[PDB]
Amino acid sequence: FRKMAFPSGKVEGCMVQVTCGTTTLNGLWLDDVVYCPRHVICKSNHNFLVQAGNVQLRVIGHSMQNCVLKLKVDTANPKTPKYKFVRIQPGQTFSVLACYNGSPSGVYQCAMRPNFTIKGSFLNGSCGSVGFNIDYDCVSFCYMHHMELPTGVHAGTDLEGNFYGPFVDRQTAQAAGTDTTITVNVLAWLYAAVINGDRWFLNRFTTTLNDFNLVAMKYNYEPLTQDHVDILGPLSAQTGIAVLDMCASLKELLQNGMSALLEDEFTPFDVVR
Amino acid sequence: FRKMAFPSGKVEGCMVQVTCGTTTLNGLWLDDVVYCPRHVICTSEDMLNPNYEDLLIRKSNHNFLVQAGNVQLRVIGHSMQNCVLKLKVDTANPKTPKYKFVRIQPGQTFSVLACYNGSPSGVYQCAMRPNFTIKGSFLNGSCGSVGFNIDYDCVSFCYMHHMELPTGVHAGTDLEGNFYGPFVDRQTAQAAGTDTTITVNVLAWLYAAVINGDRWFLNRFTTTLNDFNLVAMKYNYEPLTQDHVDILGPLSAQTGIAVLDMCASLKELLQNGMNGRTILGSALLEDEFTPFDVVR
Ligand SMILES: CC(C)=CC[C@@H](O)C1=CC(=O)c2c(O)ccc(O)c2C1=O
């Protein structure tokens, strides 16, 4: 199994450079609007320098929405794809197109951690890089990168500029809470191991949701929701392994050890695809 | 430090769908040539002992359905170069990036754009294993998916996917149709040689661990190159060569840690384990970053 990112092509043709005075970051150019972190003003249209490759764009209007600055420009972006702005929940996955001063640098697959950070790894100038999912040619933009937290992880907003997690776009000491493990994603990945070839970790035992959660929380694992059980029901059908018996494999796996560590960045949806 | 794949847009614009009778693969449309694996001209039978020159002489331009999205391409010429089919078409590809073909060596990295039936599905980052295989993650019909690097908007194509080995790994060719490793595009009992860790990549990754925060794995010792190899090959690590030592020289300079000291560090790590500790962001020693990657 390899984590894969979505192909980044449709998002690549939307990335511009946005410069206000001494500060430069990335922006997202959809139709005639460029989206970027409001941090770029730390005004009337003329002091916003927006470049899409070799051209310069003329800002003809500006507007804030929460922590995102909306820059209206003279031209619509002819490379605009079909797109939605969505907000994801911890444990869901998405791809990030890291950019430096407008130029897409690389792409990687993420999970929104349960403490609302992403273990990204970032170029010096990746502010305003976006995260997205693609379904049948529709880009779901779900993340705009703002900050690195002192602990090496990253914090950002949705494309309506609402922060994920208890962070502000001021230079206050802020720290991630204790990150947990995305339990429902480990289970999907253990299903994917049996749906492939691996079934040594299976056992004849089951467990209850309550007795599993007490075991789980001590190894810093997210509690498991009766909805979490439901979502993994397709995979229980495909393999013949009930969710609470895969939990017994997981409970035992949490005490004996034996990739060689348990992956938590594949959603159940990811595994079905 | 997240492994990143290259932005895939320049290769997305080149993927097509190649069909021959009942066989559909991915092809690579550059200027007015579509490249794809010659296996596309095989049938039901054929797979065990195909005679590709025989099957190809029997083919006309109009037996090849080449589709780019919703547009069918007219093939106006065909030709085999090693294990790759090359179809000449009507139209140059308008989206053709600046490109070149290169052949890579074990231990070098690249991105793979995995496609089905001509549509890109995902991109991942990759190392060519020492035994000349790939640990890919391939959907059903990813064959003809290509691998590549991008440097200053120039696309170097270096891999084309052909087959999945009985052990779960993947074999392919360069874009001139010469296989990497001792494999043939043939359904016979062929096995990957024993895979080993890319030692020069772990040491580069260890230097990247020092340039960032961590020094917890360092130690007082040093080692000779020969003594290092005798220990490491007992863990299925690739022998380090003078070339590899020379290649690590730059990172040695930036850290003031000598190459053979870093080697002594790695010896101890292989002896001890992590003790549930973490180096960059991994409980595993990571061997798919090259010395070239680490600098950038
Ligand atoms: C190589 C092996 C031990 C078994 C499969 C072999 O028959 C085969 C070779 C091949 O080259 C190929 C492609 O190139 C593309 C698709 C595809 O299924 C195939 C194949 O199955």
From Swiss-Prot, chain A:
Changing residue 127 to A: Complete loss of 3C-like proteinase nsp5 cleavage. Changing residue 187 to V: In strain: Zeta/P.2. Signal peptide: none annotated. Residues 1-273 are cytoplasmic. The active site is at residues 39, 127. It is found in: Host cytoplasm; Host Golgi apparatus; Host nucleus. Inhibited by pyridone-containing alpha-ketoamides compounds 13a and 13b. In turn, alpha-ketoamide 13b (tert-butyl (1-((S)-1-(((S)-4-(benzylamino)-3,4-dioxo-1-((S)-2-oxopyrrolidin-3-yl)butan-2-yl)amino)-3-cyclopropyl-1-oxopropan-2-yl)-2-oxo-1,2-dihydropyridin-3-yl)carbamate) inhibits SARS-CoV-2 replication in human lung cells. Inhibited ex vivo by michael acceptor inhibitor N3. Inhibited ex vivo by compound 11a and 11b. Residues 1-273 form the Peptidase C30 domain. There is a cross-link at residues 3, 72 (Glycyl lysine isopeptide (Lys-Gly) (interchain with G-Cter in ubiquitin)). It catalyses: TSAVLQ-|-SGFRK-NH2 and SGVTFQ-|-GKFKK the two peptides corresponding to the two self-cleavage sites of the SARS 3C-like proteinase are the two most reactive peptide substrates. The enzyme exhibits a strong preference for substrates containing Gln at P1 position and Leu at P2 position. Cleaves the C-terminus of replicase polyprotein at 11 sites. Recognizes substrates containing the core sequence [ILMVF]-Q-|-[SGACN]. Cleaves and inactivates human TRMT1, preventing tRNA guanine(26)-dimethylation of tRNAs. May cleave human NLRP1 in lung epithelial cells, thereby activating the NLRP1 inflammasome pathway. May cleave human GSDMD, triggering alternative GSDME-mediated epithelial cell death upon activation of the NLRP1 inflammasome, which may enhance the release interleukins 1B, 6, 16 and 18. Also able to bind an ADP-ribose-1''-phosphate (ADRP). 3CL-PRO exists as monomer and homodimer. Only the homodimer shows catalytic activity. Interacts with host FBXO22; this interaction promotes the proteasomal degradation of nsp5. This is 3C-like proteinase nsp5. The chain holds residues 3266 to 3561 of 7096 of the full protein.
